[PDB]
Structures are given as C-alpha cells and as structure tokens.
C-alpha cells in the first residue's frame, strides 16, 4: 500500500473544491519513492519505500536510528 515506511504517511481523503464550491471527494497521496539507503554498519543497501519527508527524517536522525525504530514497530525491511 502507499505507506511511508519511516513516517507512516498514507493516502488521506479530502475535497476538490471548484470556484462554485462544488465538493468532490479526492485523495492526497504521499510523495513516495523506493530508495536504496547505504547502511554502513551492515555494509549493505536497504531499500525502503519512503516519502520525501521520510528521507529528510533519515538525513536528520540517521539510517541506523530509523531502522532501529522500524524493527521496534514490527516494520519489515
């Protein structure tokens, strides 16, 4: 499913609104990308499906901390 493995961001629903304020249901999707992250501690690449926001989280916190969070949530990588 379209779920960020780092942040848990997923599709949310809302409205399109016309100029006449006609509401039609829409979705807002996360900006997801499959990305190979270098994990220096394992001498390995780990692929995560991550939002652009999740990539900024990884840049800030570091991949090792994030993967530690993933294991503790039962999030498989």
């Amino acid at each position: 499913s379209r779920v960020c493995q780092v942040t848990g961001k997923r599709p949310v629903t809302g409205n399109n609104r016309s100029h006449a304020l006609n509401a039609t249901k829409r979705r807002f999707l996360p900006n997801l990308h499959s990305h190979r992250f270098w994990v220096e501690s394992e001498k390995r690449f780990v692929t995560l499906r991550v939002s652009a926001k999740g990539m900024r989280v990884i840049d800030k916190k570091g991949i090792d901390t994030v993967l530690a969070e993933l294991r503790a949530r039962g999030e498989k990588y």
């Binding site: 270098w38 220096e40 990539m55 840049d59 570091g62």
Partner: peptide
C-alpha cells in the same frame, strides 16, 4: 547538508555519493 570530508553540499550529493563511497560523513 553539512558533511566532514574524510578523503555544505546538496543532500543528494551527500546521500548518494560522498557518504556511501566513504568520502565523507554528516557534520
């Protein structure tokens, strides 16, 4: 992205080249 050269950048330069090739680490 702030890095220490082991051998400020654009985040992609750090993420996808410098850090994996062992040329730098984040500040």
């Amino acid at each position: 992205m702030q890095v220490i050269l082991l051998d400020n950048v654009k985040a992609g330069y750090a993420r996808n080249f410098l850090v994996p090739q062992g040329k730098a680490v984040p500040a």
